[PDB]
RNA sequence: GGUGAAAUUCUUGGAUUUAUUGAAGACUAACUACUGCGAAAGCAUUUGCCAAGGACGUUUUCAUUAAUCAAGAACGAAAGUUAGGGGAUCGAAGAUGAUCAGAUACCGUCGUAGUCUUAACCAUAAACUAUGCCGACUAGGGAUCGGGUGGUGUUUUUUUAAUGACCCACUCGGCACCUUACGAGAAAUCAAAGUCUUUGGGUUCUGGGGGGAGUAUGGUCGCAAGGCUGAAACUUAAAGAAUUGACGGAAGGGCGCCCUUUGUACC
RNA sequence: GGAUAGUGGCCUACCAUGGUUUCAACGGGUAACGGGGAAUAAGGGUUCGAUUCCGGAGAGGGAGCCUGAGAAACGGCUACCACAUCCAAGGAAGGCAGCAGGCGCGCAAAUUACCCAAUCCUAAUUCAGGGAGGUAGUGACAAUAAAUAACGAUACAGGGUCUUGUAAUUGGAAUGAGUACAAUGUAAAUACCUUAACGAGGAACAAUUGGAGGGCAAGUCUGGUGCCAGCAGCCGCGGUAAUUCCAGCUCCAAUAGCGUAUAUUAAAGUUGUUGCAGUUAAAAAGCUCGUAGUUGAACUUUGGGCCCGGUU
């Protein structure tokens, strides 16, 4: 549940007043593959 | 709502309600 | 506050700021000391002698009129008792409450009070045997204390 | 005030009280009970070696599936049998039973990157070569 | 009981200075309390103290003048070598130029800077700034 | 009698009820308070006996004799254990009934141990102010309890003197309260929970995320019930103070639809 | 008194009944040789010290002993114990926790090399001997210094006649990584220092390792795949507890190094002496007395005058 966790927790920082990069098809995935 | 009664180890009455519903140790030289 | 209680009272006496010569006294020094030794020749303790000389003969306090303490005066004439006065009264009270406890066995508050009095007695006896007034052991105990007090 | 003795000659009380308090720590108690030598699966060691017992498909969920599985391995020096998270996919075609893998610890668990219920070991080497070079096609696994 | 009369005296001074009174009454007095207030007056942190002499222990009445942030005792009177007295000031003084920690040496009761000057150390008594 | 309803129950040898009298054991209503005492648990009729305490007053006495306290000791609500006594009430266990959708109205009657006391045990409670004990200073006010001081102040003598009671002012020591924030705190709130990042008056005890677990083992106390001391492996990222609302089948109004008030988890 | 090199319950005879302990004796654990020291830098502390020096103990476990000034020696002996070797079956020989090296145990650790030239030791002694030690080989333990490119011209883009950026554009310069006459170097060699000659036009002589919601720096990137009782109809869209299912492009950090595991330290004021907290968040014994422990009221030569000489 990477997408739901990131999309839920990037909105709380919007209430707290901090910059968040806008989402696209690059956020909720394995950016780096494992060994 | 009522505040729950707080303790570290569970009380003896609640222990009664939950429970109703040997060899020595070693000291190796 | 009190040693074995919850009270915090300050009911006591305040010695006046004068080390000499009440003006209206103008009587003597040796007449006072012979009154003291004669009152002790009845057999009274220093506190009762002090209160009688305050209540009857205009002696404000004996430390300033005679220049010497009452107990040291009685020690100078050899009228000093074998045990000091406060330990004697503590022993007498302990004896009386103990006799009550053989008579009334169930009185638990009197047991606690006896324990308090005996702790007081032990502390005072430790103080006296420290300063070499009693024999260096003096061994307060239950029975012979009666024979000790009277 | 402040609870503790503060007198100039009360160092003995301070030391003894501090000793009992430090016994109520966690790092200190783990160090002086010596459970790294008696109860830990590794013998207090960083890495270890083990012979692969078998492999079980502990899968995240059903048909829509994210395939992250683990092996069951037996230690050599101790004999205790543990579970190990193999790294990235396709390596279970590479490691089979009885291959004498070399194990380490896993690390952090957050929202992702492996939240497996009770697997703290990752297979660092297999058949005494690697997983990285054996996945990046640098070296090849020798037979037996 | 009154285990440290210097502590109670300095605490009374602190409370009455924080609440803004003009006079402070101190009981009981001592040689050490008198010397402590002479150190304060010679550095000017207080006003004018006069000692009422009854036969029991005396009392002190001190004129404050403002100008005093905080004074206190360090208890127990730690044995303080000279080679680490700077550690003590770096422990509890706001800056390196003002504020004084007070030492009782065999040369008397004296602030820290003349304890450097006389090259003598002793026990720590208190601080004032 | 009993319940929302019924039944078991007692009664024309008169139940229930009224009056006269007796017997038993237990408890002391109303007075009863934001009052008192006790180290705490706790303590409420009268009188007598025995001893004890606190506060106040003291131009009495000793001159540091003290504060806190592992070992050790005394007491310790209710419950519970062994003999004796007593057994009115209430009443674990137990016996019996209707079990009627719902008991939102899960009970009725009888009733052993107990409840009371003696001689012994046990030593725990939400044993709570959830606030160790001793000492210092810091703010306004009004009540109240105990003692003491002063009043060409009041009232009762049967002649107005003592005393008693009341009123005014002060003081010591208490139980409590209203406001405030000079200060503190995460907040509720606090004259202490203040004098603390400007951190040190003296000293005992206790705690180190949650489970496992007050478990297992050992020791010790106990006739028993049980008490005191008390881990680990393993596992997990979690587990106090306020305000704010969706939700309403909370209701009340209007003219199916709107408006006001309204309280916001365990099994 | 015996014995010892010598004091001494070190041992024996006789006679006393003592010695240690809450200031924690005695017992137990130590994955404990002790110290000089090491890591961590606000201070205080926490952790480590098998290891280059100093002191102790041991040569597979115990014991005994000969020689000698010195040994309870082990590259000396004797005996037992545990291993275990040679055979003619009668007998004999053994001690790598010295240097190399082998087996085993393991996450975990080098050459069965050269030499006494240096440092020093032993002897009858300048001469001999020394796996003590030095040299080299293996060696990304750790530590220091810094190559992988530099300068123009052209044509554009600029800041706009002085100053930067781009290009399948162009030019000559410079030199070490390597190959090596030689000489230094060395006990003799290898390597370093020096240098005749050769040695740069990029796939050349090509740098990796981690990452890219936030911590914490850098994507309003690309493509492919498995599924859908949802649209469309064979083109596809969207969603896909796919915890992205797989690959590529671009970017960031560090850089001859980078990541990971474990342990420990700091930021930590979660060990609190400096410096924690206990009404309600973990945490004030039910209450009182009381021994050791800790702590404990005030007071005793102050003040004034004299001189001299030291430092700014």
Interface of D with A in 58-117 (CB under 8 A): 87-88, 111-113
State which H helix or E strand residue E72 sits in: strand E71-73
A2 in D contact zone (CB under 8 Å): yes
D20: CB partners within 8 A, 6+ apart:
none
CB E12 within 8 A of CB E72: no
**Phi, psi at E119, each rounded to 5°:** 55, 50
D54, D55, D56, D61: CA torsion to nearest 10: 180
Question: Which burial class, exposed, middle or buried, applies to B27 when counting CB atoms under 10 A from its CB (0-12, 13-18, 19+)?
Answer: exposed
Experimental technique for the deposited model: cryo-EM
Neighbours of chain A (3+ CB pairs under 8 A): D
Residue burial D29-65, b: 16+ Cβ < 10 Å; e: rest: eeeeeeeeeeeeebeeeeebebebeebeebeeeeeee
Chain F footprint positions (protein CB, under 7 Å): 38-40, 50-67, 74-76, 118-119, 126, 130, 132-139, 172-174, 182, 194-196, 198-214, 216-218, 227, 232-237, 240-241, 264-265
CB E101 within 8 A of CB E84: no
CB E127 within 8 A of CB E102: yes
| B29, C53, D59, D61, D70 from D66: Cα distances, Å | 50, 107, 7, 7, 13
Residue at token pair 């990235």? D88
| A27, B5, C25, D114 from A6: Cα distances, Å | 8, 37, 100, 16
Alpha helix segments (H runs only) across chain B? 12-20
Instruction: Write down the number of H helices and E strands in chain A.
Output: 1, 0
CB D73 within 8 A of CB D100: no
CA pair distance D138, E4, nearest whole angstrom: 79
State which H helix or E strand residue D121 sits in: strand D121-125
CB C73 within 8 A of CB C66: yes
C14 in E contact zone (CB under 8 Å): no
Opening angle at CA E114, ends E112 and E120, nearest 5: 80
Chain G footprint positions (protein CB, under 7 Å): 23, 28-31, 43, 47-48, 105-108, 210-215, 219-222, 226-227, 240-247, 260-265, 270-278, 280-284, 288-291, 293-300
C19 in E contact zone (CB under 8 Å): yes
Token digits of residue B2? 């009522």
CB C25 within 8 A of CB C65: yes
Same topology, domains E1-68 and E69-129? Answer is no
- The domains found in chain C, sorted by start residue, are 26-80 (no CATH), 81-150 (1.10.287.10)
Residue at token pair 């957050």? D110
CB D101 within 8 A of CB D95: yes
CA pair distance C35, C53, nearest whole angstrom: 8
> Given its phi and psi angles, is residue C117 left (phi above 0), alpha (psi -120 to 50 degrees) or beta?
alpha
CATH code 3.40.718.10 for E69-129: no
CA pair distance D99, D143, nearest whole angstrom: 10
> Which CATH code is given to the segment(s) E1-68?
3.30.1370.30
CA pair distance E17, E7, nearest whole angstrom: 15
Residue at token pair 């127990």? E76
Resolution (A): 3.7
CB C106 within 8 A of CB C55: no
CB C128 within 8 A of CB C88: no
A7 in D contact zone (CB under 8 Å): no
Q: How far is the CA of B1 from the C1' of F248 (A)?
A: 18
Ordered by start, the domain boundaries in chain E are 1-68, 69-129
């Amino acid at each position: 549940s990477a997408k739901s966790f990131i999309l839920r927790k990037k909105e709380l920082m919007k209430r707290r007043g901090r910059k968040v990069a806008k989402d696209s098809k690059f956020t909720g995935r394995k950016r780096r593959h494992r060994f | 709502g009522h505040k729950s009664y707080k303790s570290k180890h569970a009380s003896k009455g609640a222990l009664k309600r939950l429970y109703k519903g040997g060899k020595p140790d070693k000291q190796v030289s | 506050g009190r040693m074995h209680s919850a009270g915090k009272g300050i009911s006591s006496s305040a010695i006046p700021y004068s080390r000499n010569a009440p003006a209206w006294f103008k009587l003597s020094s040796e007449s006072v000391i012979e009154q003291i030794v004669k009152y002790a020749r009845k057999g009274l303790t220093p506190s009762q002698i002090g209160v009688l000389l305050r209540d009857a003969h205009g002696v404000t306090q004996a430390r300033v009129i005679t220049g010497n303490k009452i107990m040291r005066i009685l020690k100078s004439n050899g009228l000093a008792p074998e045990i000091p006065e406060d330990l004697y009264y503590l022993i007498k009270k302990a004896v009386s409450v103990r006799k009550h406890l053989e008579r009334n066995r169930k009185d638990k508050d009197a047991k606690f009070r006896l324990i308090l009095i005996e702790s007081r007695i032990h502390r005072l006896a430790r103080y006296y045997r420290t300063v070499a007034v009693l024999p260096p052991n003096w061994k307060y105990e239950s029975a012979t204390a009666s024979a000790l007090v009277n | 005030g402040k609870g503790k003795p503060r007198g100039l000659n009360s160092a003995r009380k301070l030391r003894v009280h501090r000793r009992n308090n430090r016994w109520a720590e966690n790092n200190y108690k783990k160090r002086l009970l010596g459970t790294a030598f008696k109860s830990s699966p590794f013998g207090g060691s960083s890495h270890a070696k083990g012979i692969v017992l078998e492999k079980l498909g502990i899968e995240s969920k059903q048909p829509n599936s994210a395939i992250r599985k683990c092996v069951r391995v037996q230690l050599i020096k101790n004999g205790k049998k543990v579970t190990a998270f193999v790294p990235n996919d396709g390596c279970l075609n590479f490691v089979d039973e009885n291959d004498e893998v070399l194990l380490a610890g896993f690390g952090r668990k957050g929202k992702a990157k492996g939240d497996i219920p009770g697997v703290r070991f990752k297979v660092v080497k297999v058949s005494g070569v690697s997983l990285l070079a054996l996945w990046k096609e640098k070296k090849e696994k020798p037979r037996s | 009981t009154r285990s440290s009369v210097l502590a109670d005296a300095l605490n009374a001074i602190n409370n009455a200075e924080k609440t803004g009174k003009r006079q402070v009454l101190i009981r009981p007095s001592s040689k050490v309390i008198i010397k402590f207030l002479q150190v304060m007056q010679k550095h000017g942190y207080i006003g004018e103290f006069e000692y009422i002499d009854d036969h029991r222990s005396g009392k002190i009445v001190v004129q404050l003048n403002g100008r005093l942030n905080k004074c206190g005792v360090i208890s127990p009177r730690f044995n303080v070598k000279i080679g680490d007295i700077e550690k003590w000031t770096a422990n509890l003084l706001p800056a390196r130029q003002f504020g004084y920690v007070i030492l009782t040496t065999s040369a008397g009761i004296m602030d820290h800077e003349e304890a450097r000057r006389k090259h003598v150390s002793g026990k720590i008594l208190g601080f004032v700034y």
